[PDB]
């Protein structure tokens, strides 16, 4: 049994989804300790993990799967598959309009083009599970792409990306060159870069031949390029994450709401500007020595500084959570979670509906299906429980799913989220009455957001 099939079988035996995500990431970067990686490597340095086990990823994704994907699934050019080649220091994309048929796709490949599948998780359920579990421990959307390059060619021009990348070598061998940020403004870049020429690059901080089973990580801002040598092709899956999840983005949300709270709660932000500040403020007077100008600048900085007091941090913290619940991929349930949830109710069609009518009781012991499926957020004057269970494997195919949580149950809905994975007896919920304890539990269970210790009858 390959290390992957084995680690997956190992994950199916782990109760907590949080412990399941941790363990999976632990497996992805092994032997390297996750605490060391996140402390010294993450967002800091480029890292290569020499696995020395060409079967490490066996079962994840292969070229045969991609080939089977072009034949069965409705793989679309541009929308899903991309074909590109790098020649004479120029990036060219050969993308015919329409569906990507095996005959056309392999034609481009044989022609020296590289193929990139944009949404592997939408086709491969294995990749979905991988990303779906790894995202819970990233606290951010775990995207992914698949690159297939033919022998002796380069599909992409040097460049950097706007996400933290984890390259997994699946088949073949490939020569990689990773560079550290060229200038200060490129370190942890906000946006992806254009395609670079060899003249723009300095010396590689890392240059290696990734072998199947190896992992290569590098931060956003780190330029990189790879190429296939004589005799063999290459196939890798690049796991990405942390796109626009910086402190700056958090601020972007905080600030507008901050200046608003302040203007409402503090008169100093409601005081009128100078009747003649235009006489000394502006590019035109950027060189003026008018003392009033320095007073203005001083007043601005002082006021800006005072915003940290009015910043609705927990609010924006929830909004980002809501957006993440929205960005997340649907959860992959373990056999146990399935059997103990609505998804595993023995209610089927045998004739007539058999085993129909399972009822939750004040005795039933329950707890959230997983830890990263739901998030409680308060918008307007109401409270809503956002969840991922009904999310598509296609980024934003569906829209923000939620259900209104009434105050009489808020305390109980908050408890359930916090006490995971501890089984809570429904009858002992922090609500006003039994009708409020059963409704919530029933409403959640039927949604497939909750599970019971023992299968319902």
């Amino acid at each position: 049994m390959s290390p992957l099939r084995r680690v997956l079988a190992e994950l199916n035996r782990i109760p907590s989804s949080r412990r399941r995500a941790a363990r999976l990431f632990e497996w992805l970067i092994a032997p390297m300790p996750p605490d060391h990686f996140y402390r010294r490597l993450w967002e800091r340095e480029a890292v290569l993990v020499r696995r020395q086990d060409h079967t490490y990823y066996q079962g994840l994704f292969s070229t045969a799967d991609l080939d089977s994907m072009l034949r069965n699934e409705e793989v679309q050019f541009g929308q899903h598959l991309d074909a590109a080649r790098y020649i004479n220091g120029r990036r060219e994309t050969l993308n015919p309009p329409g569906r990507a048929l095996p005959a056309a796709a392999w034609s481009l490949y044989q022609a020296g083009c590289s193929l990139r599948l944009l949404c592997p998780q939408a086709f491969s359920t294995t990749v979905w599970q991988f990303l779906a579990v790894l995202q819970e421990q990233f606290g951010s959307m775990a995207g992914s792409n698949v690159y297939l390059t033919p022998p002796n060619s380069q599909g992409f021009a040097p460049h950097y990306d706007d996400i933290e990348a984890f390259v997994l070598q699946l088949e073949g061998r490939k020569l990689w060159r990773v560079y550290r940020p060229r200038v200060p403004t490129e370190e942890l870049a906000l946006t992806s870069s254009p395609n670079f020429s060899q003249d723009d690059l300095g010396e590689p901080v890392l240059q290696t031949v990734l072998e199947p089973g190896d992992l290569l990580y590098f931060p956003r801002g780190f330029i990189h390029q790879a190429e296939c040598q004589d005799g063999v092709h290459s196939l890798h899956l690049t796991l990405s994450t942390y796109q626009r999840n910086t402190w700056g983005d958090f601020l972007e949300a905080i600030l507008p709401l901050a200046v608003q709270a302040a203007m409402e709660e503090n008169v100093e932000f409601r005081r009128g500007l100078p009747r003649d500040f235009m006489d000394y403020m502006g590019a035109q007077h950027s060189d003026s020595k008018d003392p009033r100008r320095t007073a203005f600048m001083e007043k601005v900085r002082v006021l800006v500084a005072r915003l940290g007091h009015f910043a609705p941090v927990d609010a924006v913290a929830d909004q980002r959570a809501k957006d993440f619940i929205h960005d997340s991929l649907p959860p992959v349930l373990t056999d146990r979670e399935r059997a103990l949830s609505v998804y595993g109710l023995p209610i089927r069609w045998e004739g007539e509906p058999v085993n129909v009518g399972a009822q939750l009781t004040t005795e039933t012991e329950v707890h959230m299906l997983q830890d990263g499926i739901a998030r409680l957020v308060g918008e307007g004057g109401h409270l809503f429980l956002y969840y991922t269970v009904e999310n598509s494997r296609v980024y934003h195919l569906e829209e923000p799913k939620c259900l209104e949580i009434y105050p009489q149950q808020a305390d109980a809905m908050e408890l359930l989220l916090g006490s995971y994975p501890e089984f809570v007896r429904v009858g002992d919920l922090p609500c006003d009455s039994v009708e409020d304890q059963l409704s919530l539990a029933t409403t959640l269970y039927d949604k497939g957001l909750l599970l019971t210790k023992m299968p319902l009858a």
Partner: peptide
């Protein structure tokens, strides 16, 4: 290049 978004 590497598009983090599943489908545009």
């Amino acid at each position: 290049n590497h598009q983090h978004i599943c489908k545009p």
